[PDB]
Amino acid sequence: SMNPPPPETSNPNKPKRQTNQLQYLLRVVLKTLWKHQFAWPFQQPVDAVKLNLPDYYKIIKTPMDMGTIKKRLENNYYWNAQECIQDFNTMFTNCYIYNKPGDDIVLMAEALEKLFLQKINELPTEE
Numbered sequence: 001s002m003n004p005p006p007p008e009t010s011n012p013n014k015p016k017r018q019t020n021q022l023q024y025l026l027r028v029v030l031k032t033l034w035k036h037q038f039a040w041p042f043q044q045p046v047d048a049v050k051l052n053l054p055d056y057y058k059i060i061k062t063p064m065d066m067g068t069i070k071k072r073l074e075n076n077y078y079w080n081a082q083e084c085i086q087d088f089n090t091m092f093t094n095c096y097i098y099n100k101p102g103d104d105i106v107l108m109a110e111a112l113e114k115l116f117l118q119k120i121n122e123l124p125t126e127e
């Protein structure tokens with residue numbers, strides 16, 4: 001069970017822009033989650049080889065992680081806030097799909113998601 005290529009972070013064919021909401025998603029949302037004590041499993045794609053999770057990419061067909069999101073934000077990959085919000089939600093949902101309630105990794109995702117929800121509640125109106 002080899003690892004797939006990671007999600008793209010650059011694509012000249014994809015439209016993109018800078019928006020004040022995307023700036024907030026980087027400076028506030030990503031930065032807050034990235035520094036958290038429980039961020040580290042989510043800072044790069046799941047390595048199913050090293051973790052001995054050969055079923056991971058049989059079950060999780062839309063992988064996502066904060067390393068990817070960080071690069072997307074820094075590299076101005078997104079057209080709007082919704083695209084980036086969707087990536088975060090994909091990441092959390094994947095973790096809950098693959099794992100079981102009360103697992104350590106699920107508690108870690110839950111902690112991060114609580115903070116995500118607190119920050120997204122104050123997403124600024126588009127300028």
Ligand SMILES: Cc1sc2c(c1C)C(c1ccc(Cl)cc1)=N[C@@H](CC(=O)OC(C)(C)C)c1[nH]nc(C)[n+]1-2
Pocket residue numbers: 040041042046047051052053095098099104105
């Ligand atoms: C680098 C990464 S990425 C990751 C994990 C780790 C370690 C952990 C994990 C991280 C921290 C703690 Cl305290 C416990 C588990 N769990 C796996 C699934 C699993 O069951 O893996 C073990 C078989 C436990 C290796 C998982 N699912 N989704 C993700 C994002 N992760």
